[PDB]
Design a protein around this nucleic acid. Sequence first.
RNA 1: CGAAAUCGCAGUGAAGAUGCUGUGUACCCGCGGCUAGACGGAAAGACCCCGUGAACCUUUACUACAGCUUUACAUUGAAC
Length: 49
Amino acid sequence: MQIILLQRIVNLGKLGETVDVKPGYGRNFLIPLGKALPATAANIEKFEA
RNA sequence: CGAAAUCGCAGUGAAGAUGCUGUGUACCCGCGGCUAGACGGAAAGACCCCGUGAACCUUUACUACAGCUUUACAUUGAAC
């Protein structure tokens, strides 16, 4: 899963950087608890703006 | 229950004859009894054998399946 970081978290990357995570990690923790967003054009534009 | 003008004996005969041979006996027809025979009636023998027949049962017969169980992947992630 390609995902944009919404905050610093260890061993993955910086704020706003796009990482690849395991689908379970991305789907069950980060996105539901508001630490990242799915990697789409409409979300990268939202974050950059 | 094929139809009968439906006797005994010794033989003969698909090998135990009311029906064939020889012979003996016997006038025609009932009624009351009897069950020696009509291999009597009844049930396409269940005993036995056969059929590349059936069924159900058993098992360390064959081949399978349910169920149980093992591991690989997915649901399934993070850190040391």
